[PDB]
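Deviations from the work plan: none for this task. Representative record:
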Amino acid sequence: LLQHVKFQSSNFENILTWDSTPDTVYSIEYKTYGERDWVAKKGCQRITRKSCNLTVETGNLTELYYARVTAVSASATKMTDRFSSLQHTTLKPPDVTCISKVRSIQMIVHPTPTPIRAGDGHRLTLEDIFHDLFYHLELQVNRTYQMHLGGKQREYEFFGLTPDTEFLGTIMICVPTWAKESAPYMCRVKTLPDRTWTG
Amino acid sequence: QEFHFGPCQVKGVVPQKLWEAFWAVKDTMQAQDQITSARLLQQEVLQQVSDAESCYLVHTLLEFYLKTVFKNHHQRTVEVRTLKSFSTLANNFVLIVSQLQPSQENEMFSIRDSAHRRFLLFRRAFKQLDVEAALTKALGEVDILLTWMQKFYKL
Amino acid sequence: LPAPQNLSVLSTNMKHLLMWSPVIAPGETVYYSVEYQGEYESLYTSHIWIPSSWCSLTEGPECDVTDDITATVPYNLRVRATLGSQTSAWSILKHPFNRQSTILTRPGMEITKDGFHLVIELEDLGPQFEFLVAYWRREPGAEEHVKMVRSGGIPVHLETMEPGAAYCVKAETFVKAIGRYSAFSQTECV
Ligand SMILES: *[C@@H]1O[C@H](CO)[C@@H](O[C@@H]2O[C@H](CO)[C@@H](O)[C@H](O)[C@H]2NC(C)=O)[C@H](O)[C@H]1NC(C)=O
Ligand SMILES: *[C@@H]1O[C@H](CO)[C@@H](O)[C@H](O)[C@H]1NC(C)=O
């Protein structure tokens, strides 16, 4: 019939998926926990695909949601677990710009935009949504040891490096109170060679 | 890093550990509440609670959870994992409540009244359900309560 | 079956061990079961004891109850012995245990230096712990800085050093759940 009806959420992009005939037909409804009426997702009635983008319809962070799939051969219905985007969402690696210099590596963390929009206004970032959000940055030196930097700020720079040497930068977003940690962004970079007489 | 509910500071309670306890059992508890049409901790209860309100509201909600919800949960559960997870939450809620000494002077009366108003909206919703159903629902809504409290976890 | 006697908790760096004298039973091997109540259960549901995570029918005269103690409040613990049909009566720990009283040792610590850079590796005490590291250039001059290090087991950079004077370092532990720091470790100098 229908197994594994559930949400996947990454950066508050909320995708419903399911699995288990070859000519089987899927129709989707969604609803807010605490309201009585099921709504039909437009673009996802009588589909053959196993996927449905609810990012817009499950995008109020103070609500919880239910969704439900009706299947029938060429019938049975299953609903999801109660869904909270805040709880469920995974975080993508941050977008970072790593700049090599001769004796440092600078890293600029860009804010991460989100499909969440603030009442009458701009799309919110992760930094707006989680007040406790911070960055953890590591530079692996030799292969023996690590330099650690971190905080809420966005620009960082590792000082004291040898010219002309390979390092590995890894940068994560951390939201400690929700036990969230992103996939790492990684940059493998060489400090530039030192051709001047400044040491 | 503590909870700051207006002037009351609460130490020794780690938000991610409260989640870890609730997420061990969240699915089974939410699956059991068969009433998708009603929510007890509604938006009106918890939306834009002032800092000065927050301490009185949190005290009243937690006490209700301790005296009514967790007590009857403990008395009825037949699953050891929900006994353990709700012990963790109830024990940490005890520690929160012991640290709440909000002002009892008269200039605070209308602020406590606003907070009690919000609590009574929750209480009324709870008493509209059959009692087995209201208990199940209030257990499965712990997450709404944790999510609200966490907003006050700061420097 | 005699009940087990001499119950105590040894709690070291947030690991809590319940311990008792073994019950004598020449013949067969005795098993033990441990149960607990937090303060919540103690005050509001005093008749309810919860099974320990890792000690139902355990064998040795102890139990790691770390995973059962999940709040900074006093806990009751009780233990009994089994030998088939014969269960002993329950034995109750005399003074309720609160993890606020855990024994925080000074952290172990290894200093190292790849050429000019100074590096530290703390001992892995677990998620419960954050590390404070004080370091300074050893002259009248400089004033001691402080790097918070999240986790043990990793060799972390502290400072790149300058020629002339030795640099000295000590480390301390901090446990958010109880609001307590350990003593500093021995100062080491390179
Ligand atoms: C799910 O839908 C949303 C929009 O409804 C998609 O993401 C945003 O929408 C438009 C079109 O892609 C873009 O202009 C925005 O820049 C997108 N924002 C983000 C944060 O990606 C989203 O990618 C869709 N996902 C699907 C179809 O898998
Ligand atoms: C999210 O939901 C609540 C009430 O349901 C509302 O007050 C809030 O403004 C919502 N977000 C909007 C309208 O963008």
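The pocket of 2-acetamido-2-deoxy-beta-D-glucopyranose (ligand 2) is lined by residues A 60, 62-63, 119; B 43, 47 (CB under 6 Å).
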